[PDB]
Every structure is written in C-alpha cells, then in structure tokens.
Design a protein around this motif. Sequence first.
Motif, PDB file in Angstrom:
ATOM      1  N   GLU A 171      65.358 143.110 -57.473  1.00 14.57           N
ATOM      2  CA  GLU A 171      63.971 142.881 -57.608  1.00 14.57           C
ATOM      3  C   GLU A 171      63.696 143.097 -59.113  1.00 14.57           C
ATOM      4  O   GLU A 171      64.419 143.800 -59.758  1.00 14.57           O
ATOM      5  CB  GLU A 171      63.415 143.557 -56.713  1.00 14.57           C
ATOM      6  N   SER A 172      62.557 142.550 -59.249  1.00 11.58           N
ATOM      7  CA  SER A 172      61.870 142.767 -60.809  1.00 11.58           C
ATOM      8  C   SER A 172      60.516 143.057 -60.542  1.00 11.58           C
ATOM      9  O   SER A 172      59.709 143.099 -61.788  1.00 11.58           O
ATOM     10  CB  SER A 172      62.146 141.342 -61.508  1.00 11.58           C
ATOM     11  N   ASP A 173      59.740 143.432 -59.537  1.00 11.15           N
ATOM     12  CA  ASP A 173      58.283 143.367 -59.307  1.00 11.15           C
ATOM     13  C   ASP A 173      57.763 144.566 -60.216  1.00 11.15           C
ATOM     14  O   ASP A 173      56.420 144.537 -60.712  1.00 11.15           O
ATOM     15  CB  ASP A 173      57.782 143.821 -57.856  1.00 11.15           C
ATOM     16  N   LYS A 174      58.510 145.455 -60.846  1.00 12.13           N
ATOM     17  CA  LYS A 174      58.169 146.435 -61.740  1.00 12.13           C
ATOM     18  C   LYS A 174      58.146 145.708 -63.101  1.00 12.13           C
ATOM     19  O   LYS A 174      58.048 146.620 -64.234  1.00 12.13           O
ATOM     20  CB  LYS A 174      59.125 147.642 -61.563  1.00 12.13           C
ATOM     21  N   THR A 175      57.943 144.555 -63.338  1.00 12.65           N
ATOM     22  CA  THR A 175      57.790 143.878 -64.287  1.00 12.65           C
ATOM     23  C   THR A 175      56.679 142.891 -64.011  1.00 12.65           C
ATOM     24  O   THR A 175      56.308 142.531 -62.979  1.00 12.65           O
ATOM     25  CB  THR A 175      59.002 143.078 -64.667  1.00 12.65           C
ATOM     26  N   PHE A 176      55.920 142.348 -65.208  1.00 13.34           N
ATOM     27  CA  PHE A 176      54.663 141.664 -64.907  1.00 13.34           C
ATOM     28  C   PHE A 176      54.668 140.334 -65.927  1.00 13.34           C
ATOM     29  O   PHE A 176      55.060 140.425 -67.305  1.00 13.34           O
ATOM     30  CB  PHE A 176      53.639 142.669 -65.089  1.00 13.34           C
ATOM     31  N   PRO A 177      53.820 139.302 -65.720  1.00 18.16           N
ATOM     32  CA  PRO A 177      53.543 138.292 -66.400  1.00 18.16           C
ATOM     33  C   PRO A 177      52.431 138.734 -67.477  1.00 18.16           C
ATOM     34  O   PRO A 177      51.584 139.258 -67.159  1.00 18.16           O
ATOM     35  CB  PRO A 177      53.258 137.211 -65.461  1.00 18.16           C
ATOM     36  N   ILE A 178      52.735 137.842 -68.707  1.00 20.38           N
ATOM     37  CA  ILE A 178      51.784 137.781 -69.676  1.00 20.38           C
ATOM     38  C   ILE A 178      50.972 136.227 -69.416  1.00 20.38           C
ATOM     39  O   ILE A 178      51.688 135.527 -69.112  1.00 20.38           O
ATOM     40  CB  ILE A 178      52.216 137.831 -71.030  1.00 20.38           C
ATOM     41  N   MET A 179      49.619 136.386 -69.512  1.00 19.18           N
ATOM     42  CA  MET A 179      48.845 135.143 -69.004  1.00 19.18           C
ATOM     43  C   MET A 179      47.913 134.629 -70.041  1.00 19.18           C
ATOM     44  O   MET A 179      47.344 135.438 -70.678  1.00 19.18           O
ATOM     45  CB  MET A 179      48.102 135.818 -67.710  1.00 19.18           C
ATOM     46  N   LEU A 180      47.955 133.429 -70.269  1.00 20.27           N
ATOM     47  CA  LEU A 180      47.184 132.723 -71.261  1.00 20.27           C
ATOM     48  C   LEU A 180      46.791 131.251 -70.629  1.00 20.27           C
ATOM     49  O   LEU A 180      47.901 130.751 -70.176  1.00 20.27           O
ATOM     50  CB  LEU A 180      47.679 132.757 -72.770  1.00 20.27           C
ATOM     51  N   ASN A 181      45.598 130.676 -70.755  1.00 21.03           N
ATOM     52  CA  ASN A 181      45.059 129.298 -70.498  1.00 21.03           C
ATOM     53  C   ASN A 181      45.545 128.929 -68.953  1.00 21.03           C
ATOM     54  O   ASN A 181      45.309 127.833 -68.526  1.00 21.03           O
ATOM     55  CB  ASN A 181      46.105 128.397 -71.307  1.00 21.03           C
ATOM     56  N   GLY A 182      46.148 129.923 -68.252  1.00 19.96           N
ATOM     57  CA  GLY A 182      46.562 129.687 -66.836  1.00 19.96           C
ATOM     58  C   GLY A 182      48.150 129.688 -66.565  1.00 19.96           C
ATOM     59  O   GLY A 182      48.450 129.683 -65.526  1.00 19.96           O
ATOM     60  N   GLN A 183      49.023 129.911 -67.782  1.00 20.68           N
ATOM     61  CA  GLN A 183      50.176 129.612 -67.884  1.00 20.68           C
ATOM     62  C   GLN A 183      50.888 130.897 -67.671  1.00 20.68           C
ATOM     63  O   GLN A 183      50.266 131.905 -68.492  1.00 20.68           O
ATOM     64  CB  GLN A 183      50.761 128.941 -69.222  1.00 20.68           C
ATOM     65  N   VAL A 184      51.570 131.315 -66.875  1.00 18.11           N
ATOM     66  CA  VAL A 184      52.678 132.521 -66.843  1.00 18.11           C
ATOM     67  C   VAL A 184      53.428 132.462 -68.221  1.00 18.11           C
ATOM     68  O   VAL A 184      54.576 132.299 -67.808  1.00 18.11           O
ATOM     69  CB  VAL A 184      53.090 132.918 -65.558  1.00 18.11           C
ATOM     70  N   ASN A 185      52.848 132.301 -69.390  1.00 22.32           N
ATOM     71  CA  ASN A 185      53.568 132.014 -70.512  1.00 22.32           C
ATOM     72  C   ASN A 185      54.596 132.918 -70.992  1.00 22.32           C
ATOM     73  O   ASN A 185      55.348 132.803 -71.820  1.00 22.32           O
ATOM     74  CB  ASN A 185      52.542 131.884 -71.581  1.00 22.32           C
ATOM     75  N   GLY A 186      54.769 133.984 -69.857  1.00 24.79           N
ATOM     76  CA  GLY A 186      55.903 135.006 -70.308  1.00 24.79           C
ATOM     77  C   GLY A 186      55.865 136.179 -69.417  1.00 24.79           C
ATOM     78  O   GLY A 186      55.075 136.039 -68.309  1.00 24.79           O
ATOM     79  N   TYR A 187      56.511 137.117 -69.700  1.00 24.55           N
ATOM     80  CA  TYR A 187      56.642 138.325 -69.095  1.00 24.55           C
ATOM     81  C   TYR A 187      56.869 139.462 -69.555  1.00 24.55           C
ATOM     82  O   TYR A 187      57.295 139.445 -71.117  1.00 24.55           O
ATOM     83  CB  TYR A 187      57.874 138.202 -67.674  1.00 24.55           C
ATOM     84  N   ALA A 188      56.687 140.699 -69.189  1.00 26.02           N
ATOM     85  CA  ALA A 188      56.928 142.104 -70.266  1.00 26.02           C
ATOM     86  C   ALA A 188      57.548 143.117 -68.958  1.00 26.02           C
ATOM     87  O   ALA A 188      57.326 142.785 -67.811  1.00 26.02           O
ATOM     88  CB  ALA A 188      55.535 142.693 -70.485  1.00 26.02           C
ATOM     89  N   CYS A 189      58.226 144.071 -69.717  1.00 22.06           N
ATOM     90  CA  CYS A 189      58.890 145.034 -68.975  1.00 22.06           C
ATOM     91  C   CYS A 189      58.435 146.353 -69.475  1.00 22.06           C
ATOM     92  O   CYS A 189      58.379 146.340 -70.457  1.00 22.06           O
ATOM     93  CB  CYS A 189      60.366 144.768 -69.029  1.00 22.06           C
ATOM     94  N   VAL A 190      58.385 147.183 -68.577  1.00 16.87           N
ATOM     95  CA  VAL A 190      58.158 148.453 -69.028  1.00 16.87           C
ATOM     96  C   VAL A 190      59.730 149.436 -68.790  1.00 16.87           C
ATOM     97  O   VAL A 190      60.063 149.706 -67.777  1.00 16.87           O
ATOM     98  CB  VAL A 190      57.451 149.286 -67.809  1.00 16.87           C
ATOM     99  N   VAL A 191      60.308 149.504 -70.049  1.00 17.09           N
ATOM    100  CA  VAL A 191      61.496 150.332 -70.335  1.00 17.09           C
ATOM    101  C   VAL A 191      61.450 151.451 -70.969  1.00 17.09           C
ATOM    102  O   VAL A 191      60.484 151.435 -71.924  1.00 17.09           O
ATOM    103  CB  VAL A 191      62.324 149.234 -70.898  1.00 17.09           C
ATOM    104  N   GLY A 192      62.126 152.570 -70.679  1.00 12.39           N
ATOM    105  CA  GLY A 192      61.964 153.830 -71.182  1.00 12.39           C
ATOM    106  C   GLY A 192      60.652 154.235 -71.569  1.00 12.39           C
ATOM    107  O   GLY A 192      60.408 155.043 -72.652  1.00 12.39           O
TER     108      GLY A 192
END
Lengths: 153, 153, 153, 41
Positions: free
Chosen positions: A1-22
């Motif tokens: 699973e990856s739910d501990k990671t989250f999308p960056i959002m612009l214009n309504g596009q989940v134009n990317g994602y981000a992770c909390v590491v270390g």
Amino acid sequence: ESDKTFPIMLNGQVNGYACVVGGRLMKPLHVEGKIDNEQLAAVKLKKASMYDLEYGDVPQNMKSDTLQYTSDKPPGFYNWHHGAVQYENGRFTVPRGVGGKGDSGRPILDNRGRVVAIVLGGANEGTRTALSVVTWNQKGVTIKDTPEGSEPW
Amino acid sequence: ESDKTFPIMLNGQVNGYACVVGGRLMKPLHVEGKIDNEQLAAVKLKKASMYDLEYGDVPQNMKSDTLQYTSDKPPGFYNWHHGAVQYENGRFTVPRGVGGKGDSGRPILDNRGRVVAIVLGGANEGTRTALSVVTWNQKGVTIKDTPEGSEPW
Amino acid sequence: ESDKTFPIMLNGQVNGYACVVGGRLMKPLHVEGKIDNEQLAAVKLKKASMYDLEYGDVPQNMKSDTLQYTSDKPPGFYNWHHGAVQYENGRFTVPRGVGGKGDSGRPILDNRGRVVAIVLGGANEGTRTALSVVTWNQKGVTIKDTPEGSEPW
Amino acid sequence: VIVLCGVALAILVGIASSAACIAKARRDCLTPYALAPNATV
C-alpha cells in the motif's frame, strides 16, 4: 500500500504525488500545485533542482509516521502503485507503456515496507518502459537515475 | 444524476446553484455567493447581465463532465430538482406552489438526462406557477422566458 | 445530542471547540485558530477577556437547535466529552489524567440535555481532577472559576 | 490651448465611448450565442 503518500493538486489534476520519507517531505520540483495533505503545505521546502526534487522537514506531530528508504537494490520485483516494477541491469524497468504521466513523485517500495526510490518520469525503447528516478547509494548517497530522453510524468 | 450540478453558497450556506453546459459554467447573477468547486471558482465569469446570469469556460479537465444541451421541447414533463414541470405552449409550468427562493441555477432535464433549461425564479398568474428560466430557441439561440412576476428565486 | 458542537481547528489539529447557547455563539478567547464552520466564522467575535471567551450572534436559522443552557446545577453527575464529569463542592471534577489540551471549549450538559458549563483546564492535587470552568449561578450569572494553577487547555 | 484640449477631449470621448458602446452591444449580442455552444451563429 501507499496511502502514507499524497497527491499534489493543481487545476484539478492530481498532477503528481509526494512522499514523507525520513521525516522529510519529498515532491518533484518540476511539478507545482497544492499537496493534498494540507499539513504538508505548511512545510517550507529546500530545493535540489539538479535532481528536480525539493524537500522539507515534516512537522513533528506526524513525523514518526514517515516512511524509510533503503540501501538495498538487488534486481527483482518491487511493489509499485501500478502493481510492481522489475529492477533489472541496475535499472528500474516497466512494461512498455503502462502507468505514466501523472506519477511524478510516486514511490517504489521494498516488500519489507520500505521505499527503494522515487520516480520522476519515464522513457521507453520498446522492449520496456525505462524509468527516471532518484535512488540511494549503499552508503546513503542519494543519486538520480535517468535513462536518456526520459520524459517527465 | 444531479452530481454534475454544483451549489452556490453565501455566509457558508447555499443560496443558489450553478451548472456546466457545453463546457461553460453558468450561475445566476442575482445569486451573490461563492462556488463549492475551487477549480470552478478559478474561472473568470463573464457577466451576461442581459440574462441575469454570468458564465465562463471551464477547462478541459472536466470536458466530458459538462451537461449536454438539447433544444427540442415537446410538450410534456421535464425533470427538475423537485420533480418535473409540464412544458406547454413555450411555458415551463411547475405544479403550482412547489419550489421557492434559493433554487436558482437548478437545471431542468429531459428524460434522456440532458439539460433543457435553467431555473431563474417563478410565481403564479391565476392558473399555474410559471418559472422564469433561460433556455435556447428552436434555432438554438438562447432566450430568457420570464412571465411577469416570476421574481428571481 | 451535542453532536453538532463545533470543533475549532488550527494547523490541522483540533485545538479547541465552540458552542452556541440560546443562539449566542461562545468559544474560548485563549483558543487560537478559527472555527471550522463558515456560518459561524462569519460571526464578528467580541472579546470577553475577563472571561477568557468571545461571543457573537449566529444566523437565526439555528434558533431551532441552538443548545439550551440551564443555570441550575445541583451537585451530581453531568454529561461531558469524555463521558461524564463529577460536580461537587461547587467545582467540576474528572478522574485523574483524563483529557487535556484541545478540550478547551467542550461544554458540560445535564443528562436531560441542557448545557451548563464549559471546560478551560484543570488541576490535580488533593482530590479528583477539577476543571477550570465558567458557570451559571442560579441568579443566571455567568461566572468563571479557576482551580489553583489550572493550566489553560 | 483650451480649444486644442477641447478637440483632444472630444475625440477621446467620442472614440472611447463609442468603442465601449460597440463593445457592450457586441458582447451582449453574442451572449445569446455564447450561451449556445451547440448552435451556429
């Protein structure tokens, strides 16, 4: 699973994602927008534009929930947001034309529940889709891998 | 069904509504209020004051999600937020007494699930409750029909 | 129930709570941040520095469900966030170590369903853990009480 | 200088005000078509 990671959002596009590491937020630099986990937006980022990445210390209130990276990179399958990727010849490789644009900042994880690398975007010769990604040296040296002509995702 | 429509809100409460048709958002001008969807809020509305309405082109990320308009209006029941209204001799007629303020911007629908009109207000003359609405002529040109006293809802 | 009592939010944390009594909104003054409800956020809050509170007037639509206060408070058990509070010797008390920071603004209520007080903090020595609390004397007078050294939650 | 500024003012008012009138008329004449993306003007 990856739910501990989250999308960056612009214009309504989940134009990317981000992770909390270390305990640090990590997101692609070439991708701009609102990180969906609004608490992450309170972080002030520091940039590594050669790696096309930026980071900042995640707030303490949830910093213990961060994922952790690996030194391990033996060839084989690793769990991915699109099932898995085959690490081979020392490179992250994906079937020709699957997943893709929109996955900037998507993690690739160790089966043990650890993160082996962060993807930036892909390329494909035809035999396989080649992935451009930031990874880690056995002594902790963060190193970006990017097959030639790799497009941003 | 109505999930494609969106509320308009003032003082944290809904006081009107808006809808997307052919990729163009519209909201009543008389309804002072903000729009729920932040991406819709980002659009620059054009004040079609001659129709007590304002509109703006919504970006292609919701290209498929706009309502499709249809100009054919055989006399009969047309779907509505509170049910349906009998179209007759060019008038959109509500079964008298239902509806009221706070409902402008609500579409009116064909049984095929396609938008035919937008609620602007309404009242009764002596036999039926007429609704003031904006609609498109037989030639497709949009027109405002508003039997006198059909004050804006 | 007290279901509709409203949380106060700051930096994503639930840093407090707020209540509406007889239509008058009331929340702690010391509690930073904002009310998570926009209808209530529209209220022009007025400082009550001696009482460590701030009160305004809510949109009258909630006049049908604003929380009914009662001043008369015989000693005994009263409903609370963490189940219940014990009221004796004129002071509100709880079991040792329960609750804490962010509970500021939680109301106290008669099991018949009438609010009576609001928590501000507490202290531990010698007896049950007492709550710093604002109270309503049978005169109908709001009165703030502070057990010695109670920290503001 | 007075009559020259009178000429300049009158010309600027005439042009800018007539252009505003024309723009308003155009805007609201197209508006029934702007609201009709499924129709041909």
